[PDB]
Amino acid sequence: AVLQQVLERTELNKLPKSVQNKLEKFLADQQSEIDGLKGRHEKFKVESEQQYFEIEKRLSHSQERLVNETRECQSLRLELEKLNNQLKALTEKNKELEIAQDRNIAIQSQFTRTKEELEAEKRDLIRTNERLSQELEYLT
């Protein structure tokens, strides 16, 4: 009872029932509103802080992902620098090997022609030996 919270029981009692009850309800309505506002405020406070925390959680989380991704990019740039050096070294090495192969092809061609030269001379000597032998086979 709110009016009991306002007036002394003696002075309260000397009031008409119409007066007492009207006072009681209006005063209780004001008191009800006060508790209504405090409750609504504390309700909002907790819920607003809660929702804020959740979004604060996400931001701090993504920022961690951002710093991670940033490091990865730097790491990739390091690998790119390494691979680029490895391609250049391999490209030069392979071009030297292609030239070495070209020299070998030339050498094997040179030997092939040389072989045919000797094969011709061998045939000529056997032929020349044959004629000299053919003449001497006749005499005995």
Residues 80-119 that bind a copy of itself (CB under 8 A): 80, 83-84, 86-87, 90-95, 97-104, 106-108, 110-111, 113-115, 118-119
Cα distance between the two ends of the chain: 165
Residues 11-30 that bind a copy of itself (CB under 8 A): 11, 14-19, 22-23, 26-27, 30
Give the separation between CA 135 and CA 140, rounded to whole angstroms: 10
Residue 138 binding a copy of itself, by CB under 8 A: no
> DSSP states of 26-49 as a string?
HHHHHHHHHHHHHHHHHHHHHHHH
Shortest spacing between CB 13 and a copy of itself, in angstroms: 11
Shortest spacing between CB 4 and a copy of itself, in angstroms: 9
Spatial neighbors of 24 by CB under 8 A, at least 6 apart, are: 1, 2, 3
Residues 41-80 that bind a copy of itself (CB under 8 A): 41, 44-59, 61-63, 65-66, 69-70, 72-73, 76-77, 79-80
Shortest spacing between CB 58 and a copy of itself, in angstroms: 6
Give the separation between CA 52 and CA 138, rounded to whole angstroms: 126
